[PDB]
């Protein structure tokens, strides 16, 4: 047996938009909602037999299976449902487009009403190979009003006129559309208008009530009649308006609703059942479950009873409803609601277009703004002793914030040991996942040990975290390209995020009480993406000015200043200890010749600070430079070099020794091109 299995990795190229057909919907969902609503109150709380909710449409709670594809909330992506609807309710989404497609076609024989090869010209202009979307829309903006200024249709003989979208904004008229007999001017003969007045002669003279008082309504298009009208030109122009028909969609007739697509349950989850029977509804579960009601009304209506007057206002309430189902827009057109109402004037009935739309809604604040996992948030606190490009992390968020590792060949005698610690002590792991891809093994029960004695190669463990794990670090509302950085994490006690003060300026970190965000990456190649590219050291500068944005600030400047102060001196014990403290140990210092000799021995601050730059003789740092710190004082103008001055001066460095001047921001000071921590880099 066993036919070969073949697959190829695919990625999305393009998104072809379209309306679904009238047919493809019912060709999709499993079950007609149809029926009625009721949500079957009996036996179970809302076991939901057929109806808007439905087990074979989807599920909500993790309780009961999904029928079609079951297995609860894990694997069921939802399915659709297709609400059968009586009469062709109009559509608010494509509405303003419907005013185009209908704007541009004669209202009688319904042939595209621009004519001859001119219409062909519009075509030949479109298909020219280099036309972009903007060009398209512009050409449409031409072809449309080009047919407006036509009067009589070409081969119908009938005339036509403007179509005005009756009134605006309320929802009373807002879904009703009107075109009329216009541009009659009354002096020219209109045989049509002659027919028109002769028509009413059999009403007024019969039923004088209506009379001329309420009059001059002309006519409208029943959203029914408008699809009976869309059904005419079923080819020909099409795209002239804007729709490619090789008939995947099959023309401009699906624009208006016929079968209304019921969304899955996983889109409209019933709110938690909570204590006691009523679980809160969830929008779409109430709107369309009412639309079923008003539908089956108009289905049982129009079947036997009702009346042409008491027919429509229902049907109108249908299009007004479903419009309110996919939008807000029309608010309260002197109506108030029906079954399942309230009526304490609940404003935000809008459930759909907006959840997709604005502010922090779906599309932006949710899909592009995705809230994330493997993170942490804490107050800050300075740590000078810690180097740059690290973030001290409290071990108590190191226990619970883990990094995945695939143990292979080099890691064992760490990891087969690293398990036996267990999740409680820090340098250890908690979750474990075997190559057999089962689910995973928490470290909860027991074992370990004899568990770690296996640990095959492709198995995965999750380390707590250690010294060296690359962690990217974020702060506030992030003003510019330096907020996200990445640091080698180092674990310490207490609890708070300790960065090195020098990196406070990119974050404009004030300490005080501000909060951070600690993000570990996950996949092995996102790490090497972080510290290497997005890390501190290489991003030491700024993107815009090519100017050092990390340097000494506050204490570091002034303290450095007080060592740089020409007044100062030191001694081989004091200096020796400084030149030590500058690096906690670890280094081989070659003490240069002392500045003055005789009345003791001393070393000027420019040296004890100079050795900072070139500690060894093997440190391959050789600099030289001139600069001006601020409050520079012009010398006696006779002296051309400014190095000699009333005080301090140029900072001019040669052979990586400081020669003249104090330092004091400026040279080490964050934000002038000429600079020490700049030049070294």
């Amino acid at each position: 047996k066993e036919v070969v299995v073949s697959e190829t990795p695919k990625r999305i190229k393009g998104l072809e938009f379209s309306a679904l057909s009238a047919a493809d919907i019912v060709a999709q969902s499993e079950v007609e909602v149809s029926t009625r609503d009721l949500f079957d109150l009996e036996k179970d709380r809302a076991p939901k037999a057929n109806g808007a909710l439905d087990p074979k449409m989807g599920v909500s709670s993790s309780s009961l299976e999904c029928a079609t594809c079951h297995g609860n909330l894990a694997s069921c992506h939802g399915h659709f449902g297709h609400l059968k609807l009586a009469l062709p309710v109009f559509h608010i989404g494509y509405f303003k487009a419907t005013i185009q497609i209908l704007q541009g076609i004669c209202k009688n024989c319904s042939a595209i009403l621009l004519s001859e090869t001119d219409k062909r010209q519009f075509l030949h202009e479109l298909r020219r190979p280099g036309v972009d979307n903007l060009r398209r829309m512009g050409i449409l903006k031409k072809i449309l009003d080009q047919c407006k200024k036509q009067r009589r249709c070409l081969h119908c003989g009938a005339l036509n006129g403007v179509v005005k979208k009756a009134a605006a904004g309320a929802g009373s008229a807002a879904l009703k559309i009107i075109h009329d007999t216009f541009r009659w001017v009354g002096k020219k003969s209109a045989p049509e208008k002659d027919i028109w007045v002769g028509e009413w002669k059999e009403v007024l003279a019969h039923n004088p009530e209506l009379e001329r008082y309420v009059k001059r309504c002309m006519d409208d298009l029943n959203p029914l009649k408008t699809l009976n009208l869309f059904k005419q030109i079923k080819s020909a122009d099409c795209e002239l308006l804007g729709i490619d028909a090789t008939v995947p969609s099959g023309r401009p007739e699906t624009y208006i609703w016929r079968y209304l697509p019921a969304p899955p349950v996983c889109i409209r989850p019933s709110v938690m059942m909570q204590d006691s029977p009523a679980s809160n509804e969830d929008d779409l579960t109430v709107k369309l479950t009412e639309i079923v009601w008003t539908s089956s009304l108009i289905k049982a209506g129009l079947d036997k009873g009702i009346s042409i007057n008491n027919m429509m206002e229902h049907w109108d309430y249908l299009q007004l409803t479903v419009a309110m189902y996919i939008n807000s827009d029309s608010v309260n057109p002197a109506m108030l609601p029906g079954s399942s109402n309230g009526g304490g004037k609940v404003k935000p009935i809008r459930g759909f277009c907006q959840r997709l739309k604005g502010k922090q809604g779906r599309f932006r604040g949710n899909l592009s703004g995705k809230r994330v996992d493997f993170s942490g948030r804490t107050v800050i606190s300075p740590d000078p002793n810690l180097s740059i490009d690290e973030v001290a992390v409290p071990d108590r968020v190191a226990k619970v914030l883990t990094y995945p590792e695939k143990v292979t060949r080099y890691n064992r005698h760490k990891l087969q040991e690293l398990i036996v610690n267990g999740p409680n002590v820090h340098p250890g792991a908690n979750y474990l996942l075997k190559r057999n891809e089962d689910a995973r093994r928490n470290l909860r029960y027991g074992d370990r040990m004899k568990l770690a004695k296996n640990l095959q190669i492709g198995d995965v463990v999750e380390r707590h975290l250690e010294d060296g794990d690359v962690v990217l670090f974020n702060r506030q509302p992030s003003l510019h390209r330096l907020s996200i950085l990445s640091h080698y994490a180092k674990i310490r006690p207490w609890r708070t995020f300790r960065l090195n003060e020098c990196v406070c300026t990119p974050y404009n970190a004030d300490f005080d009480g501000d909060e951070m965000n600690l993000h570990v990456p996950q996949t092995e190649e996102a790490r090497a993406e972080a510290i290497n590219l997005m890390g501190v050291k290489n991003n030491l500068l700024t993107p815009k000015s090519g100017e050092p944005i990390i340097a000494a600030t506050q204490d570091f400047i002034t303290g450095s200043y007080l060592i740089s102060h020409k007044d100062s001196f030191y001694d081989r014990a004091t200096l020796t200890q400084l030149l030590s403290m500058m690096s906690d140990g670890i280094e081989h210092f070659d003490i240069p010749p002392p500045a003055i000799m005789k009345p003791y021995y001393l070393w000027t601050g420019k040296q004890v600070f100079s050795l900072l730059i070139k500690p060894n003789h093997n440190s391959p740092v050789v600099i030289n430079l001139d600069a001006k710190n601020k409050v520079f004082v012009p010398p006696k103008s006779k002296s051309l070099p400014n190095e000699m001055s009333q005080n301090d001066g140029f900072v001019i460095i040669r052979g990586s020794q400081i020669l003249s001047g104090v330092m004091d921001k400026s040279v080490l000071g964050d934000g002038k091109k000429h600079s020490v921590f700049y030049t070294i880099l």
């Binding site: 697959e7 190829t8 990795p9 695919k10 990625r11 999305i12 393009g14 998104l15 072809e16 938009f17 379209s18 309306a19 679904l20 493809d24 060709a27 999709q28 694997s75 992506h77 939802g78 399915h79 659709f80 989404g93 494509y94 995947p248 609703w257 697509p261 899955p264 889109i267 996919i326 759909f352 997709l356 599309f363 932006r364 604040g365 949710n366 899909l367 592009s368 703004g369 995705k370 809230r371 994330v372 996992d373 493997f374 942490g376 948030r377 509302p477 992030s478 510019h480 907020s483 996200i484 993000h519 990456p521 996949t523 190649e525 996102a526 993406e529 972080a530 590219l533 997005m534 991003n539």
Partner: protein, 99 residues
């Protein structure tokens, strides 16, 4: 979910998200707004692109032309949202390797 109390998780805003673009990191986003948040396998159908569960396309009963691939669950939720409303993000597909 959101904030303290309920349980963890933090915010990457479009104000912030842009940051990593300037650095130019693709892989950090795909780890970030994709793998680490909602990692999800949708089964789609090359022919007449739409989603579907396990083996069926269900608009065209096939159990043949479906291809398994991954995608942010917010994006799927964006489809089943859309396609509910009448509009159809059909997905034209092509393979990665070999042009």
């Amino acid at each position: 979910t959101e904030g303290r109390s309920r349980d963890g998780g933090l915010r990457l805003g479009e104000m912030e998200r842009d940051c990593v673009i300037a650095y130019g990191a693709s892989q950090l986003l795909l780890e970030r707004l994709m793998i680490s948040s909602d990692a999800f396998e949708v089964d789609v159908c090359d022919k007449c692109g739409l989603m579907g569960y396990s083996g069926w396309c269900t608009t065209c009963k096939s159990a043949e032309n479906i291809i398994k691939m991954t995608i942010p669950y917010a994006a799927k939720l964006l489809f089943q949202e859309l396609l509910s409303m009448n509009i159809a993000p059909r997905l034209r597909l092509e393979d990665i390797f070999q042009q």
